[PDB]
Automatic annotation (TrEMBL), chains A, B:
Residues 31-106 form the Spidroin C-terminal domain. This is Minor ampullate spidroin.
Amino acid sequence: GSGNSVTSGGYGYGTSAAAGAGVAAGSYAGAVNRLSSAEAASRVSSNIAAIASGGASALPSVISNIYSGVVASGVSSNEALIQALLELLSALVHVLSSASIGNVSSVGVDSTLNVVQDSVGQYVG
Amino acid sequence: GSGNSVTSGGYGYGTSAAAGAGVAAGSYAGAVNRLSSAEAASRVSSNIAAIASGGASALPSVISNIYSGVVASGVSSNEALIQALLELLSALVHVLSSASIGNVSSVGVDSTLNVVQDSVGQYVG
């Protein structure tokens, strides 16, 4: 302890290759190891059919579903972001296993990016 | 600039509703409203065909491609994680626009979550 608190960068206390739970400034691995727990699986598999339907329009809805679920555990706000995002990242990649994709064009990604900013930008900001 | 610097919580500077760019410890909206730039659209459109063809097997390869691209832009290391991920999150939701999904299963997501930990778990910790 010191009492005199000032500031700190994303290093020293935690950089990478760690256990987690308030390790770095915005990086925490504990939010990740919890993904192999049934906790995530119960939420992620519930929203697979949501993202599969909305594509990107489901993001602001599904992220909200998962985020609140993680925060309900009593986790740090910033670490909750990570876990909730990681749980989110799992729902939409699993659907591709069954999603017989056709042909995607390299156009309109610019516009899709404008949408992703809406869903998570309000959590990282 | 106080001589000494002891760690503190990621608040005070830009707790919420902030424009971005090193606003919080692990939260930055600046890494999000930059996605509407040609920068992301030029990277993410190269990732769309990759993730579409792998589902989750492309994550560890695509995330790294984008991450190194963002870090070389002179961005903060922990902030890069956010932007690089947001650009990543844009590629895989774009593909659903032309990906006619059929029937996904709520079983196996538990296992998929184990893989997502490998791709980003080395950047978040």
